[PDB]
Design a protein around this ligand. Structure first.
Ligand SMILES: [Zn+2]
Lengths: 163, 163
């Protein structure tokens, strides 16, 4: 019975954990061809917590289902400028488009995936210290766009461990 | 009878307008010794709107009452690093401290003033495209820390035109 508030708070850990494990997965799948981002290795993590577990499962299942959203995110970000303002504008546009026709778990994973790709792009183009900002983009968007409320209604982030 | 939501939305314009007029004021008071930030000149503005008027009044009255908060902000920011993460951490710490003992209009102006100084510091140390991010720091903090709710309870941002 996680409240909307609690779900909204949980998203920070879910996203950090998703980023960490997705990046570990990419390193496993790509080896030396994996895009480097040490920020994604050293971020705060609590692996055995529930939300740590959830982000990790979302990273594993996204490897399969998020493939097509990803391949585009990767093409369509190539053109983004590394300022905070461009980042935010681009984030808001894509995230709004993702949810225009409603919310489902696959689109939740897609948003996390987009956050991941956005954060990695801006880092590669020299904007350091911005991973926390993308996490904030995600947490806040999920809260104000009633994604947190939706999740809470499905049983909380813990409901994702079943996917 | 502006709702909490509406007040929260209004803060964007109030802050942009405050920044614009405060920066114009600084240029008037300091001339060539005024710190340069063209971002503060070219930001979106609607001068005859209510919130445009409110930000402008807050800029004028802050010139007198915010002097001592400011002089410190100016010293205490000198040490801040121009990453988004440092910015956010420093913003959150100071803004939380400002409101620890409650909310009043002078502390509202102080927060806008801090936003102003933070935005100008990071710009001067080379972080461009970050003014919108500081505006977002302000808007969101006011909403989640029940400042918007407080203002709404006082009659909305329009209640400030009397100060
Ligand atoms: Zn928010």
């Amino acid at each position: 019975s996680a409240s909307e508030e609690q779900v909204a708070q949980d998203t920070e850990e879910v996203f950090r954990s998703y980023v960490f494990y997705r990046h570990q997965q990419e390193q496993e799948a790509e080896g030396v061809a994996a895009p480097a981002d040490p920020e994604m290795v050293t971020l705060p993590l609590q692996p055995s917590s529930t939300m740590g577990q959830v982000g990790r499962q979302l990273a594993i299942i996204g490897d399969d289902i998020n493939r097509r959203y990803d391949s585009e995110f990767q093409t369509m970000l190539q053109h983004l400028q590394p300022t905070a303002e461009n980042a935010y504008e681009y984030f808001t546009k894509i995230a709004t488009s993702l949810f225009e026709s409603g919310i489902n778990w696959g689109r939740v994973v897609a948003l996390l995936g987009f956050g991941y790709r956005l954060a990695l792009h801006v880092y590669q183009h020299g904007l350091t210290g911005f991973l926390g900002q993308v996490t904030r983009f995600v947490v806040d968007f999920m809260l104000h766009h009633c994604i947190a409320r939706w999740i809470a209604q499905r049983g909380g982030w813990v409901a994702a461990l079943n996917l």
